[PDB]
Amino acid sequence: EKCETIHVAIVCAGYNASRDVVTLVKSVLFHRRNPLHFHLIADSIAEQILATLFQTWMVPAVRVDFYNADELKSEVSWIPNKHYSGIYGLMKLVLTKTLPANLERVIVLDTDITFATDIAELWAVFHKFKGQQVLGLVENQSDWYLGNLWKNHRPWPALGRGYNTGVILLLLDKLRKMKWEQMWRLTAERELMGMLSTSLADQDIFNAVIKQNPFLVYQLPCFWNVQLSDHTRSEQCYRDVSDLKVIHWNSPKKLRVKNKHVEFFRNLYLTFLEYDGNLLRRNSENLQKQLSELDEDDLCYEFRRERFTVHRTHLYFLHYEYEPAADSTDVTLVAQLSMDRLQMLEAICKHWEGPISLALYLSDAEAQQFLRYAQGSEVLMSRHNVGYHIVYKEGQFYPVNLLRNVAMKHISTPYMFLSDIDFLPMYGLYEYLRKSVIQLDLANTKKAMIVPAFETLRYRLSFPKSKAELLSMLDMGTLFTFRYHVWTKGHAPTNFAKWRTATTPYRVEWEADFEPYVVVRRDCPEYDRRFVGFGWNKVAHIMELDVQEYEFIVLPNAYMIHMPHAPSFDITKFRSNKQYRICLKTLKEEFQQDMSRRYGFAALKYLTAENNS
Amino acid sequence: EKCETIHVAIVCAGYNASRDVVTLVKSVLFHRRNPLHFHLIADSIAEQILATLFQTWMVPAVRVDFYNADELKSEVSWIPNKHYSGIYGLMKLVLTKTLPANLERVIVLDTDITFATDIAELWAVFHKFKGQQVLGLVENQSDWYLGNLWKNHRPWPALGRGYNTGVILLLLDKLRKMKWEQMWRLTAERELMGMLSTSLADQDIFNAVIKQNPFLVYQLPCFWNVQLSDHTRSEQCYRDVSDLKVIHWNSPKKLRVKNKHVEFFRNLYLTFLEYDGNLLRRNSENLQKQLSELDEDDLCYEFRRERFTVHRTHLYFLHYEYEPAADSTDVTLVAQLSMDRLQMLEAICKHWEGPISLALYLSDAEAQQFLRYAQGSEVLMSRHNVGYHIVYKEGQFYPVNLLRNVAMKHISTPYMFLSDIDFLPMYGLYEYLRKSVIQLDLANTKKAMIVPAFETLRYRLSFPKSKAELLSMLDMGTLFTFRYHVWTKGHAPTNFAKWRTATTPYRVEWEADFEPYVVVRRDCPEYDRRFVGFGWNKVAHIMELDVQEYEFIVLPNAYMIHMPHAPSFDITKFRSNKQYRICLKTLKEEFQQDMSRRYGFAALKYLTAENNS
Ligand SMILES: [Mn+2]
Ligand SMILES: [Mn+2]
Ligand SMILES: [Mn+2]
Ligand SMILES: [Mn+2]
């Protein structure tokens, strides 16, 4: 009917799979022509990642339904397995019970597949099933089951070379009809009485129920999944580029394998592993209705256009693991960055010790480059507790607030710290703020902690170690208060003069254009989307913290030393475009009046200050 | 007939059209199934750009043939024109005179089209013509020809709304048998006596050729040429997404046109242009049979493969121009730059008055980012004499020598200066180099000039004026010799102590690891490709240029000072693994041996040095 709403099922388990299903879905969608409907069996972490990802793509004619695996985990718990994927591999057979009875046919695909062609043609194979051919599989393209690869090998019984369950084409309705659960269960225990465990997890069990009843299978043509292993024989299963339709990269080495034409296959792989998904995307009604009233005649309307724009967010790109402590007083950094500021990560990785978040902002190709880089550095790899929240590129402006609030919402500790990637904290600051949070006891009251700012110009500076050493180095003064020659009010209002002699934190009121760096509990407000780029950005958040009656505490025994960095493009554009400035000022008026409306008299002070200045 | 052949013809003229032709070509190829054969009616400049572009793509099943336009410019010169394209617009009318009778039918697309579907489908309409209908066309979507858009409008006579020449589908074989040449010439002569000149150039005349014989034309489907302008009713001519196959941009605004659903058109415009064209590759056999015997087990397999590679080069990305001078001594810088370091491009431009030829290294998607940036900054626009040679990304290493060579060969003056964009010359270095070239009289001999290298470690410094002031800052301790803390041997042989008191140029011999910056004639040897990446990318060229009996001169009254910069991944990979260092060393002995072999005893000198060290 040209629109049958093709149905798919994918097993996701672990962060690696969570991030490989992205590539598989890219491959399927690239050649799509009719509506799709996925069905991802996911654990909690994969559930969150993929929920956010798909809810952010805004794909058309595509739907996503997530099925819990924790409840269905026990079903196969009695089947020992040895596959590197884990116990989640076997579960690809319980789909009949898990999926709804109202569905008929699903292309069960493993994560690593990649389709070079539309899945419509593969779906078409559902018009060639005859007799009691209810499953759909392909002949194995290896010698694993033949029992001749090496001496003393005892593969589980199978028909000829065996089959690889990379792609399965099912008739759910039928399997439900003829009592599918019990016979495969019976075969399962029947084939486990003699030996220890399976060798390929689900792939093994299916082969059993393939061998015992050979009238269910349907020997699809070999070129539906060109299995590539260390002993591949796909050369006879393809002749040219056009014939290939689908690939399976079954190897622990993955991309390090060697073949006669591995170059072309790898090039194709990178074609879609690097394709700009933000282009494939062609909640919706409200979004479009907001887009309706939008006017193109405003000075900086584009700020309004970008205020509510939705960007593809792929949360937790790389592995992440964290065990919360009993104290319940942890802190985690957050920061935006792009290419120009990557190098600082190592430095920050050499500074922090606890978890940090990061709203890393790159295109797809730069995202893969970062993947390689983070897979290279030993310091990054050894650090488990560093999240990597990716927000892909789109539009022209820089949605910095979007990046920082995306990093805000997803944190695994109660309190948090706001900064930028440039700043480099102390050594041991993690324990310092641990003790400080414990002592000031913010678990009850409402307070903010500020770490003062600075800036130096000695690239090869020895890392200071003690407050008294900073006193000596300021008496000599090699580095100065951050932005001491452009924006004195940025951090001068901290009144550094009294900082020196202090031994305990001191409170400070608000001042014109006061934009410190704060530590605060998670409840602190998100940023205002109206402002994208550089300029008058943090001070909005500061205004909200202040107007919520947050007392500003400045920590005595900490500080930050800006590591010099090259100028970026946002600052140059801000300093060059006057229209940017005037529309920023009108946005200032708008924000101030909205603040007044939402709180009332208390917010008038800012206005009065603007009237006084 | 199952990939019989697809033929196409494109008119190219002026620098502003090469980019358009490349985007159109990638758009067409994105949906290809059959082999393709392009005929580019091109001028000298377009010929020069596109020859190398297509010779470097290495696309399969594609043949490119260039037809000169300078010889055939006069054929239509007698026909006045007012279209923004110019005289070349009429060139679409005399293809039969150009294209040999060996061909019978060929599409003709203006450079701005962007097919959204396979061109084979369009080619299919060459079996649906009846009798004598040779020329195929589509209806104009405007009301220009109807003479009702505005008062006092007198467009050339036409049938109905008129037809647009955006896409032409010819049947040349009949069009020659009809004596088309005399017919259109007479029609034009008749239609030029009364009015002043043509309005739409070729589209203004073809329509008349239709009217005077209404039964030639084939009225194609309207949804082929969806012209987008200020007076379009295409919403009637297009219904859905599947109702779109080929788009045109018929307004000087181009990117700044407005429509009801323009969002999808903009998406369809960025969908192909954004594509990384290096993934479309699915003089050649030589490359294959060198790649054949690259031992995978060899420690330099990746290096060996990389060196022979060919990269997509798009010479003269932006407008270029140069008025030759009678001095015949002009110099032109060269540099290798990437986007992680693009920021200081203006920096070099403020310090150069004469022509300079860069060599960027960009990603297509972000190549357009660079296009926008260059079109924004007024400093670059003010200067017409700057080249921009983009060699797109490919692979993992950094073929810097490729960038340098691409900038070497294509230079409009006989003399050149080699440096890096990460450096910076004095004010007036161009004039001083001119004087030195005309004075030392290098017009005959094989000598080179060297400009000394320093470095600074503070972002914000004033720009010196004279040599005395330079040495003043130097002795203040704010400046040092370039690489005076890691690689001292790079520039030490210049023994700046001697230069300080210098008043006339002085010669020097070679020293260990001596890597100056040279000003040289254009015959100096190409950079050795065997070394790729960062590190020992230049001293090899120096030892190549020294063994060849080139004397060295160090200019007394010139300098050039380094501006601090952050690191990149190339240095990280240079310090990452020992295998890279081992392969580097292997390439080292190979270079020594081969340079000896080609020159012999003279080489032993360098060898002896490495024996001593
Ligand atoms: Mn597998
Ligand atoms: Mn900064
Ligand atoms: Mn046009
Ligand atoms: Mn450098």
UniProtKB/Swiss-Prot annotation, chains A, B:
Write down the glycosylated positions: 16, 140
Molecular function in Gene Ontology: acetylglucosaminyltransferase activity; glucuronosyltransferase activity; glycosyltransferase activity; hexosyltransferase activity; manganese ion binding; UDP-xylosyltransferase activity; xylosyltransferase activity
**What main location does UniProt list?**
Golgi
Keyword Transferase appears in the UniProt entry: yes
Q: Which residues lie on this side of the membrane: Lumenal?
A: 1-613
Keywords from UniProt, A to Z, are:
Coiled coil, Congenital muscular dystrophy, Disease variant, Dystroglycanopathy, Glycoprotein, Glycosyltransferase, Golgi apparatus, Lissencephaly, Manganese, Membrane, Metal-binding, Multifunctional enzyme, Signal-anchor, Transferase, Transmembrane, Transmembrane helix
Q: Where does Mn(2+) 2 bind?
A: 420, 422
BP GO annotations: acetylcholine receptor signaling pathway; astrocyte differentiation; basement membrane organization; behavioral fear response; blood vessel development; bone development; cardiac muscle cell development; connective tissue development
| Reaction(s) catalysed (UniProt annotation) | 3-O-[beta-D-GlcA-(1->3)-beta-D-Xyl-(1->4)-Rib-ol-P-Rib-ol-P-3-beta-D-GalNAc-(1->3)-beta-D-GlcNAc-(1->4)-(O-6-P-alpha-D-Man)]-Thr-[protein] + UDP-alpha-D-xylose = 3-O-[alpha-D-Xyl-(1->3)-beta-D-GlcA-(1->4)-beta-D-Xyl-(1->4)-Rib-ol-P-Rib-ol-P-3-beta-D-GalNAc-(1->3)-beta-D-GlcNAc-(1->4)-(O-6-P-alpha-D-Man)]-Thr-[protein] + UDP + H(+); 3-O-{(1->[3)-alpha-D-Xyl-(1->3)-beta-D-GlcA-(1->](n)-4)-beta-D-Xyl-(1->4)-Rib-ol-P-Rib-ol-P-3-beta-D-GalNAc-(1->3)-beta-D-GlcNAc-(1->4)-O-6-P-alpha-D-Man}-L-Thr-[protein] + UDP-alpha-D-glucuronate = 3-O-{beta-D-GlcA-(1->[3)-alpha-D-Xyl-(1->3)-beta-D-GlcA-(1->](n)-4)-beta-D-Xyl-(1->4)-Rib-ol-P-Rib-ol-P-3-beta-D-GalNAc-(1->3)-beta-D-GlcNAc-(1->4)-O-6-P-alpha-D-Man}-L-Thr-[protein] + UDP + H(+); 3-O-{beta-D-GlcA-(1->[3)-alpha-D-Xyl-(1->3)-beta-D-GlcA-(1->](n)-4)-beta-D-Xyl-(1->4)-Rib-ol-P-Rib-ol-P-3-beta-D-GalNAc-(1->3)-beta-D-GlcNAc-(1->4)-O-6-P-alpha-D-Man}-L-Thr-[protein] + UDP-alpha-D-xylose = 3-O-{(1->[3)-alpha-D-Xyl-(1->3)-beta-D-GlcA-(1->](n+1)-4)-beta-D-Xyl-(1->4)-Rib-ol-P-Rib-ol-P-3-beta-D-GalNAc-(1->3)-beta-D-GlcNAc-(1->4)-O-6-P-alpha-D-Man}-L-Thr-[protein] + UDP + H(+)
Query: So which tissues is this one expressed in?
Result: Ubiquitous. Highest expression in heart, brain and skeletal muscle.
The main enzyme category here is: transferase
Please verify whether the record's keywords include RNA-binding. Answer: no
- Pathway assigned to this chain's UniProt record: Protein modification; protein glycosylation
Q: Which cofactors does this protein require?
A: Mn(2+)
Q: Which domain of life is it from?
A: Eukaryota
> What does the record's cofactor remark say about binding?
Binds 2 Mn(2+) ions per subunit. The xylosyltransferase part binds one Mn(2+) and the beta-1,3-glucuronyltransferase part binds one Mn(2+).
Q: How does activity depend on pH?
A: Optimum pH is 5 for xylosyltransferase activity. Optimum pH is from 5.5 to 8.0 for Beta-1,3-glucuronyltransferase activity.
Task: Name any GO cellular component annotation.
Answer: protein-containing complex
Q: What is its EC number?
A: 2.4.-.-, 2.4.2.-, 2.4.1.-
- Subunit description: Interacts with DAG1 (via the N-terminal domain of alpha-DAG1); the interaction increases binding of DAG1 to laminin. Interacts with B4GAT1.
Disease affiliated with this protein:
Muscular dystrophy-dystroglycanopathy congenital with impaired intellectual development B6: A congenital muscular dystrophy associated with profound intellectual disability, white matter changes and structural brain abnormalities. Skeletal muscle biopsies show reduced immunolabeling of alpha-dystroglycan. Muscular dystrophy-dystroglycanopathy congenital with brain and eye anomalies A6: An autosomal recessive disorder characterized by congenital muscular dystrophy associated with cobblestone lissencephaly and other brain anomalies, eye malformations, profound intellectual disability, and death usually in the first years of life. Included diseases are the more severe Walker-Warburg syndrome and the slightly less severe muscle-eye-brain disease.
Q: What does this protein do?
A: Bifunctional glycosyltransferase with both alpha-1,3-xylosyltransferase and beta-1,3-glucuronyltransferase activities involved in the maturation of alpha-dystroglycan (DAG1) by glycosylation leading to DAG1 binding to laminin G-like domain-containing extracellular proteins with high affinity. Elongates the glucuronyl-beta-1,4-xylose-beta disaccharide primer structure initiated by B4GAT1 by adding repeating units [-3-Xylose-alpha-1,3-GlcA-beta-1-] to produce a heteropolysaccharide.
This one is known as Xylosyl- and glucuronyltransferase LARGE1
| Lineage, broadest ranks | Eukaryota, Metazoa, Chordata, Craniata, Vertebrata
Point out the gene that encodes the protein. Answer: LARGE1
Which stretch of the full-length chain is present here? Answer: 133 to 756 of 756
